[PDB]
């Protein structure tokens, strides 16, 4: 079936480094003052035991690229840089993407490019990813580093080493494989180190649900960005599925363009539709919105399509910039999560993107918000709550390998994902023979080592 050929998911498979062959030269360890000291010591011994001189690089939160550029031009020749900025980092209230490590990672990268160090950067994160459903993502925002990290790898390979996640508060794994990781020939740049081995991130095709389970829309279904392109198609799908009542929300709401014939089109399909103006970044507006739902038709599902798009390059991106532009997607999701955590929802669907699934040049500023969604969904599942972060491909990078999918087909793939209870399904139509060549044009990857069509 066409739908079953658009389904993919992320898995972590056991793998190896490829012989450490020791190191040489001087490595820098970037960290904040009085933070990640235990891990820094574990990293130092790991690197020094491999035959390298380690020096610390104490970074001041949100210092900027200019300051780091001057300091990197004084250290002299550098063999590599290990970033521990995301280690022992507290979650940022109010704005999750205001993470200092996100802003400073970008600053470090840009600075490394300016100082022309000519060496790769390796970023360590703590419990930022889950190798299995039994592991919990500690801070969903840390996922943004992996998201933007993937794009930086494609735009400036020479300066990007990779990403390594280790158990929060733990150092044993790091000081045990770090050496082999930074000096490996496997080409693994996306790894998770656990007490029971090393794992590598991999794309794999998803299986069909032989289960009788079939998600069905009941009561009221809320769709953010309902008046937008994607939210509109989702609404049409729900109506065709037999959804009783649809609540479409956006900042424009009833004033949105095309909203008029939108309701008429949905009501024609047999669904009572209501369009309301609501800014999902405003927690109070959302609370009032939810509170206005008829007791006769309780909210049962949420589809969060609200968002914005850009196209800036990594050298033009700043943590502040990213945080500000991804508010509807990120804050909208957080608010909806907090305000429905008590409701009896059957589905809570966040609209993620291929931008975070594998990332692409120019999408560096878009990847962060989508990665956060992936993490939030996994956190909800860990707490016994429903959630699905669907990484969407293009909806009908054309010749880049990704083929736009028909609205109808895309929604049936999602239906199938809800039926199998997949937390982070990837729904995209691509031609691997064309995609792979472009994705590894200047940088190889093992991300697609299990994709049949990637080996065929
Ligand atoms: N952009 C692209 O080319 C692609 C995007 N995607 C995916 O599809 C998703 C949906 O976007 P799309 O369908 O293009 O929609 P649109 O491009 O039409 O944008 C919809 C607009 O959505 C609503 N909105 C924005 N911010 C808020 C907010 N703070 N509160 C409430 N609603 C808000 C608004 O409606 P109003 O005007 O009424 O205020 C807003 O003007 C993306 O986020 C992404 O995951 C997939 C392939 C390509």
């Amino acid at each position: 079936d066409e739908v079953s050929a658009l389904r993919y998911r992320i898995e972590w498979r056991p793998t190896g480094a490829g012989e450490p062959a020791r190191l040489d030269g001087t490595w820098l360890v970037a960290k904040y003052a009085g933070t990640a000291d235990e891990t820094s010591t574990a990293a130092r011994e790991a690197l020094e035991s491999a035959g390298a001189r380690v020096r610390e690089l104490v970074v001041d939160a949100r210092c900027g690229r200019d300051e780091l550029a001057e300091r990197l031009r004084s250290v002299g020749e550098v063999a590599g840089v290990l970033s521990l900025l995301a280690v022992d980092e507290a979650e940022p209230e109010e704005a999750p993407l205001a993470l200092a490590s996100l802003a400073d990672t970008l600053s470090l990268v840009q600075a490394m490019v300016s100082a022309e160090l000519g060496c790769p950067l390796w970023t360590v994160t703590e419990s930022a990813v889950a190798t299995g459903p039994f592991e919990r993502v500690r801070n969903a925002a840390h996922g943004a580093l992996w998201g933007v990290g993937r794009v930086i790898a494609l735009e400036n390979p020479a300066v990007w080493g990779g990403l390594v996640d280790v158990p929060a508060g733990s150092v044993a794994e790091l000081a045990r494989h770090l050496a082999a990781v930074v000096s490996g020939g496997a080409g693994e740049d996306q790894l998770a180190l656990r007490a029971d081995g090393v794992y590598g991130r991999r794309w794999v095709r998803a299986a069909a649900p032989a289960t009788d389970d079939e998600w069905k829309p009941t009561g009221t279904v809320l769709v953010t960005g309902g008046t937008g392109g994607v939210g509109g198609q989702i609404a049409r799908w729900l109506a065709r599925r037999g959804a009783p009542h649809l609540l479409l929300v956006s900042r424009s709401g009833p004033d949105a363009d095309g909203a008029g014939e939108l309701v008429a089109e949905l009501e024609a399909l047999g669904a009572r539709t209501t369009v309301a103006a609501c800014d999902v970044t405003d927690r109070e507006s959302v609370r009032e919105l939810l509170g206005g739902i008829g007791d006769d038709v309780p909210l049962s599902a949420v589809f969060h399509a609200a968002a914005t798009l850009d196209d800036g390059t990594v050298d033009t991106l700043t943590g502040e910039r990213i945080e500000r532009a991804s508010r509807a997607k990120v804050l909208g999701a957080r608010n909806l999560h907090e305000l429905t955590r008590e409701l009896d929802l059957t589905a809570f669907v966040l609209f993620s993107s291929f931008a975070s699934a594998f990332g692409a040049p120019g999408l560096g500023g878009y990847a962060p918000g989508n990665a956060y969604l992936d993490g939030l969904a996994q956190q909800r599942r860990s707490d016994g709550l429903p959630a699905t972060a669907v990484a969407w491909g293009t909806w009908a990078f054309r010749r880049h390998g990704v083929i736009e999918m028909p609205p109808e087909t895309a929604c049936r793939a999602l239906q199938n994902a809800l039926d199998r209870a997949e937390v982070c399904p990837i729904v995209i139509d691509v031609r691997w023979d064309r995609f792979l060549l472009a994705y590894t044009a200047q940088r190889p990857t093992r991300l697609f080592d299990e994709i049949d069509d990637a080996r065929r």
Side-chain angles (χ1 to χ4, degrees):
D1 196 296
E2 179 183 358
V3 174
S4 193
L6 313 180
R7 286 161 57 61
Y8 304 85
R9 68 193 209 88
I10 302 296
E11 285 187 296
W12 296 77
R13 296 300 215 300
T15 185
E19 177 181 357
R22 77 174 307 184
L23 311 169
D24 179 270
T26 167
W27 276 71
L28 272 59
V29 174
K31 51 180 299 306
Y32 293 114
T35 315
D37 289 323
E38 280 54 288
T39 299
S40 184
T41 304
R44 179 193 308 290
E45 62 184 301
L47 298 168
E48 294 177 318
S49 293
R53 314 176 78 70
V54 172
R55 180 192 171 180
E56 297 202 328
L57 180 73
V58 184
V59 188
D60 297 358
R62 321 167 192 292
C63 59
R65 62 195 293 170
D66 298 332
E67 180 180 321
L68 293 177
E70 175 63 48
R71 291 170 67 192
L72 287 177
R73 279 171 181 130
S74 306
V75 61
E77 278 291 300
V78 182
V81 186
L82 179 72
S83 179
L84 300 182
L85 299 175
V87 177
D88 235 57
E89 180 171 47
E91 289 51 279
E93 270 83 314
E94 179 180 0
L97 292 194
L99 264 189
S101 71
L102 169 61
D104 294 335
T105 282
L106 290 160
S107 289
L108 224 197
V109 173
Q110 302 160 340
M112 287 175 77
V113 180
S114 292
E116 298 175 354
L117 292 188
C119 66
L121 173 72
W122 285 88
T123 293
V124 174
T125 57
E126 295 191 299
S127 299
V129 298
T131 66
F134 54 87
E135 282 184 353
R136 192 180 182 279
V137 175
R138 169 161 164 288
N139 181 185
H142 284 140
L145 279 55
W146 287 69
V148 73
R150 277 186 284 275
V151 174
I152 293 163
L154 299 172
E155 286 185 35
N156 199 316
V159 71
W160 190 266
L163 291 141
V164 183
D165 191 73
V166 295
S170 181
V171 304
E173 301 74 16
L174 197 65
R176 188 153 66 206
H177 305 92
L178 182 53
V181 168
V182 300
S183 61
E188 303 272 4
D189 61 351
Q190 296 177 67
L191 300 167
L193 302 190
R194 301 300 187 238
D196 68 348
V198 179
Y199 297 79
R201 190 168 179 272
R202 300 276 189 281
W203 266 53
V204 307
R205 290 186 176 286
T211 173
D212 302 359
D213 282 354
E214 181 180 354
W215 177 79
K216 185 141 57 186
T218 49
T220 297
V221 174
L222 166 64
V223 182
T224 69
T227 51
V230 184
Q233 294 300 154
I234 288 296
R236 298 182 180 79
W237 160 61
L238 295 169
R240 292 198 298 286
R241 264 246 34 173
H245 302 71
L246 291 179
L247 214 213
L248 314 180
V249 161
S250 67
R251 285 171 303 180
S252 290
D255 294 359
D257 176 62
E261 69 163 295
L262 214 189
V263 179
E265 202 185 308
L266 293 176
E267 300 198 302
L269 291 171
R272 203 200 74 175
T273 311
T274 292
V275 183
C278 177
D279 188 332
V280 292
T281 61
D282 195 305
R283 187 164 189 176
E284 287 297 298
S285 299
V286 178
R287 190 181 305 194
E288 299 189 59
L289 171 70
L290 294 170
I293 299 179
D295 299 284
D296 56 301
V297 290
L299 180 72
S300 66
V302 175
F303 288 83
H304 178 52
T308 62
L309 180 58
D310 55 63
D311 58 358
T313 65
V314 180
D315 61 67
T316 66
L317 294 161
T318 65
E320 179 195 306
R321 167 70 174 297
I322 292 172
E323 196 291 305
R324 296 301 218 67
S326 62
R327 282 172 175 163
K329 179 185 290 294
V330 173
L331 300 176
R334 218 258 273 85
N335 292 337
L336 292 167
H337 165 235
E338 296 175 340
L339 300 173
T340 69
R341 199 207 302 275
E342 309 314 319
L343 295 170
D344 208 53
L345 275 47
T346 66
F348 185 80
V349 189
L350 301 173
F351 282 39
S352 188
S353 174
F354 68 92
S356 46
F358 64 75
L363 292 178
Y366 187 56
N370 289 293
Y372 169 83
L373 302 189
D374 302 333
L376 175 52
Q378 296 167 88
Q379 288 187 318
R380 277 178 60 86
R381 294 295 280 282
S382 299
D383 297 352
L385 291 166
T388 309
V390 190
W392 294 110
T394 51
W395 285 62
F397 295 77
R398 305 185 180 68
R399 304 194 202 298
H400 194 68
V402 308
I403 313 307
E404 49 201 287
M405 324 169 279
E408 298 57 54
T409 311
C411 296
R412 285 160 194 160
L414 170 58
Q415 175 64 56
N416 280 137
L418 295 168
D419 291 347
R420 232 196 73 185
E422 311 188 306
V423 66
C424 289
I426 298 171
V427 184
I428 178 159
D429 183 41
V430 299
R431 299 287 172 285
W432 293 99
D433 66 305
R434 230 183 312 186
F435 177 63
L436 300 176
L437 270 99
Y439 191 90
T440 60
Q442 59 276 166
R443 188 200 175 84
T445 180
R446 281 200 180 186
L447 231 193
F448 321 95
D449 270 28
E450 295 203 358
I451 292 300
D452 62 308
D453 287 3
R455 184 179 183 182
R456 189 178 182 182

